[PDB]
Design a protein around this ligand. Structure first.
Ligand SMILES: O=P(O)(O)OC[C@H]1O[C@@H](n2cnc3c2N=CNC[C@H]3O)[C@H](O)[C@@H]1O
Ligand SMILES: O=P(O)(O)OC[C@H]1O[C@@H](n2cnc3c2N=CNC[C@H]3O)[C@H](O)[C@@H]1O
Ligand SMILES: [Zn+2]
Ligand SMILES: [Zn+2]
Lengths: 616, 616
């Protein structure tokens, strides 16, 4: 079928839906290089024996948004070697005895990294991926209309109706210029002489700052009109720094697009709100906004938390992921930090503290019941010495350079982890590791990412490794991709792997990134889905399949998933999707669940794991 | 450069704009087959000595929206052979002695139709078109950045800011389902028991009609849920009939998407309004909504007129074109008409009458000062006997079949014409012939269209005739194209000629057609420009160049053109575009004006027409 934008009007009385279609059996035996599949098994296990997961899952669960007293003690943190330890409430000598040490995770990483580029396995996986594609195509050739029509039995639900989530957005870029601009243009007119910032000697009003930069008012525009502390002074304003680097920042940008500024945030916040309202307008578009924490100051956490509250920043549709930019090397010139450790300390303690004693870090709590995952960033392509095994602890790391990627995630994993396996303990919300990974850079980012995280933000590079791509299939790791953005720098649009990763059944989702820089419409991400559908030729069952599993990839409450997709959603497979609220043919997912079940069987060579429920 | 969606942030102080760039001279002499160029000349002249144009143009021009008395007599219509005559106010014997007769226009048509497919000319034109492309590309290779940057001197203006016009939209399809639906869904809830229609025996309420069709309410959806007078009764509901055919029409459709229905329009109108309001919201998107008149009943005109008024249907941004569906053959089974003539009579008299005596057809007037052009339609591919020269008058045409295309436009031209050369006379607004042509069907549609009309709606078929395509270049005929729609039936997206017609400098524009069926966003046509920009790789200078000349193609007041583009807009060439309100490099259009000037010179072999002002 492919491409709904066009699709003409038709008919119908289907008032009783239909599974059933062409089944395609194949099966294939096996060669001596089963000792490959074996290798996959390991990597497949490893990941499992690692990525943390809540011992008791959401669906097995037993006015405003803030306050309420708690108090309950329970103690000790005791962070040893970048990996916190939290010993038994009193004082133990074993602790909540979890997590695998740094080295190990590095040696397992090499392990994956071997198999990953080992000759014959690269071959088998390629053969199996492309083989995966074909089948889906063949299937399309036999059943696209069977799928088209099923959708007609759920008269109500069509594209709009289905709730789709912007699984990868950076809060800040989340606004359309026409709006943003007009926000500014206005708050100038209707309030010039209002102190805003204090740079170069005195506090300036608004009118000041502007005439100060000169080029201002009716001339203002999103483009480079964030022209600075202002001068000749040197700062590169590529793009990552323009959002990832806290300092050397411009003037309007410090005023309007940040929170740790002077007027506390009265303007960024203020903007967010009208974002949310219009968000809550179209009812179906959700958002997993990325918010930062550099880990230079212990405050940042509470500091940010309070930003949320004091501004009443909450929506049903929005949740948050904390993004820590991997910029230590900058924070080590600026002398504000002395050894990597300091950072683990600025993010993995201000929380932990808040977990043991809620009230020691109140309205940080009311925030964390809204935080859903920890995303780490920066230009993936900056060069790096890929970590060995005998690797310097986090507090032996004083040297001038930024620690590698792998290194980042690791300590960013354990902590996250050992902290998670307690907020769980105490019955509080938990955060998931959802790294930006594989957008550029080295292949190992993914390898490591594969061993330790939930979702992922990019995956563009899975395209250069049959093997990792194949695992991610099996494992069903889920990718939140922004084609339209990826198209900016790193990759031509038409050369982007999404559609292909989609055909082969990888857990892909379409995201947005920077709607400010990127889109032309009032409705950002729909517009994504829409140009996507058109260049790649996608049907609705296709978009709907995408939007649907955007949600599975999401971090919202069971209460809302159930209501959005189905009360049976926790079920592995077809019997787990209510087309009346999903609009995707029981037959598309049955095809998908059975081709996957098949592959799994191929690799656990008859002796498969199975599981009858999805996962978190 | 190509593709703005991505484009990263940069800088700048350009506060003094720059023409200047790589000029590329070529020149070429000529062969004996100059007697080709000659042939072009003729066709080029012919068109000229035909398409009507206002002896005194808009820029040389010397609260609510309705009323005011006039009265002034002036008389006689006297339509001879489908071609009205309007003799001197009193009683003459020569009339306002204009227009060329039917035959002639048919023999000139053959003439064009010969040269058009004559061997060596097809060759020369292909060679010259593709040669046209190259140059533009080369130019892009030498100056894209020169163009990128110029745009940075007009800080203010970027894509949004620039006013773009939806030069081809069918009123009715102009709404997004989510809205349309919710309109309905609601007016059910908040007002069931309200008579709406009287079909099958009695007048039904709303609740009735619905439960009458059964499938209703929370189940309603744009798709085929226009299920009829209802039964087994046979009616094809492809798509053209679903909007072009007045009868055999459904129930909700008769209620909500039409005006000549029972509750007068209280619902279609009512809907339009909130379309306009939101239209007037985004300030920059205009609309040239198509509205129909079948010409079965003399009333239709006044009948419609009054629909506009009594509902206060006016916007700065919207104007109208009357679309008459070429369905005589249906109206000749239905016995409601006896010979083609009757139709010329139902559209070219209810107006004419209104021109001589304004007050004999008041608030028809207040309407026509808003009508801007006459668009005629239907499935272009339906087969047809392409008209000869000795051709049956309009009132000798009683036979069972629909008259050919050519035939339609002809009599639809003269009338339009001879009427135009009087509403002008009396100082009243005039209407332009803006046919839907060359979307499918035979090549001659365009040939004829080329000889007699202003803009055009499709042009997809210029792609199969070097020659017509080349004329349309020279002449600068302007095409209002809907790729996204054309993609539905007639043509794959990626195989659509637009981008190419754009490269070669044809007067192209991006349109919408049926935003109801077609788009996924709140903002229809921007979304067009946006998927276009992305699959074809267009820069902003590119879109802006497009949006800009969408307006040149438009039918609005000089008062608004000037304000939207520039007060010098009437000027042929570069010195005629104010980048500060157009955002397109004086250098892009200088390139375009000079390559055209060049080609013209090639064909009028040194002895060129010239003109220092555009045209209407
Ligand atoms: O494209 P502008 O509006 O000048 O800003 C881009 C910012 O948004 C985020 N962003 C945009 N695109 C991406 C982003 N995030 C991570 N890396 C690559 C990709 O995800 C970046 O953090 C970056 O600081
Ligand atoms: O695609 P739907 O919403 O079921 O209705 C299509 C209608 O909109 C107009 N339309 C759509 N697409 C086009 C149209 N007009 C002329 N012909 C081809 C093209 O312009 C047609 O008049 C047609 O009746
Ligand atoms: Zn990102
Ligand atoms: Zn049309």
């Amino acid at each position: 079928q492919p491409d709904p934008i066009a699709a003409d009007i038709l008919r119908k009385e289907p008032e009783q839906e239909t599974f059933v279609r062409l089944n395609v059996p194949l099966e294939v035996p096996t060669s001596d290089e089963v000792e490959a599949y074996k290798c996959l098994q390991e990597c497949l296990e490893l990941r499992k024996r690692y990525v943390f997961q809540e011992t008791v899952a959401p669906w097995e669960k037993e006015e405003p948004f803030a306050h309420y007293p708690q108090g309950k003690s329970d103690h000790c943190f005791e962070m040893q070697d970048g990996v916190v330890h939290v010993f038994a409430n009193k004082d133990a000598k074993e602790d909540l005895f979890p997590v695998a040490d740094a080295t190990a995770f590095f040696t397992d990483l090499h392990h994956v990294l071997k198999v990953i580029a080992a000759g014959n396995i690269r071959t088998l996986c390629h053969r199996r991926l492309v083989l995966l594609e074909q089948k889906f195509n063949l299937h399309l050739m036999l059943n696209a209309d069977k799928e088209f029509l099923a959708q007609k039995s759920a008269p109500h639900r069509d594209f709009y109706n289905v709730r789709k989530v912007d699984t990868h957005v950076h809060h800040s870029a989340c606004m359309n210029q026409k709006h943003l601009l007009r926000f500014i243009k206005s708050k100038l007119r209707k309030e010039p002489d209002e102190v805003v910032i204090f740079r170069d000697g005195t506090y300036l009003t608004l009118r000041e700052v502007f005439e100060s930069l000169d080029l201002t008012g009716y001339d203002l525009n999103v483009d480079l009109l964030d022209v600075h502390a202002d001068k000749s002074t040197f700062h590169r304003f590529d793009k990552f720094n323009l959002k990832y680097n806290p300092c050397g920042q411009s003037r309007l940008r410090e005023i309007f697009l940040k929170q740790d500024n002077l007027i506390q945030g009265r303007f960024l916040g203020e903007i967010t709100k009208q974002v949310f309202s219009d968000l809550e307008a179209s009812k179906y578009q959700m958002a997993e906004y990325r918010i930062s924490i550099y880990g230079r100051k212990m405050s940042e956490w509470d500091q940010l938390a309070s930003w949320i509250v004091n501004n009443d920043l909450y929506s049903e549709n929005v949740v948050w992921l904390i993004q820590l930019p991997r910029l230590y090397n900058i924070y080590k010139d600026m002398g504000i930090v002395t050894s990597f450790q300091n950072i683990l300390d600025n993010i993995f303690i201000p929380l932990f503290e808040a977990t043991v004693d809620p009230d020691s870090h109140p309205q940080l709590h009311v925030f964390l019941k809204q935080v859903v995952g920890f995303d780490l960033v920066d230009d993936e392509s900056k060069p790096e010495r890929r970590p060995t095994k005998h690797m310097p602890t986090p507090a032996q790391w004083t040297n001038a350079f930024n620690p590698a990627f792998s290194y980042y995630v690791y300590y960013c994993y354990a902590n996250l982890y050992v902290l998670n396996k307690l907020r769980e303990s105490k019955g509080m919300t938990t955060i998931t590791l959802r790294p930006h990974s594989g957008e550029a850079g080295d292949i190992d980012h993914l390898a490591a990412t594969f061993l330790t995280c939930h979702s992922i933000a990019h995956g563009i590079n899975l395209r250069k490794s049959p093997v990792l791509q194949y695992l991610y299939y099996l494992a069903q790791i889920g990718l939140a991709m922004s084609p339209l953005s990826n198209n900016s720098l790193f990759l031509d649009y038409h050369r982007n792997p999404f559609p292909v990763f989609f055909l082969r059944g990888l857990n892909v989702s379409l995201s947005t990134d920077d709607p400010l820089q990127i889109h032309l419409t009032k409705e950002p991400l729909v517009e994504e889905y829409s140009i996507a559908a058109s260049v790649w030729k996608l049907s609705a069952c296709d978009l709907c399949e995408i939007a649907r599993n955007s949600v599975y990839q999401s971090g919202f409450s069971h209460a809302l998933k159930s209501h959005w997709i189905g009360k049976d959603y926790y079920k592995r497979g077809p019997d787990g999707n209510d087309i009346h609220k999903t609009n995707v043919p029981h037959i598309r997912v049955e095809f998908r669940d059975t081709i996957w079940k098949e592959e799994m069987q191929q690799v656990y060579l008859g002796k498969a794991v199975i599981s009858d429920e999805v996962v978190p």
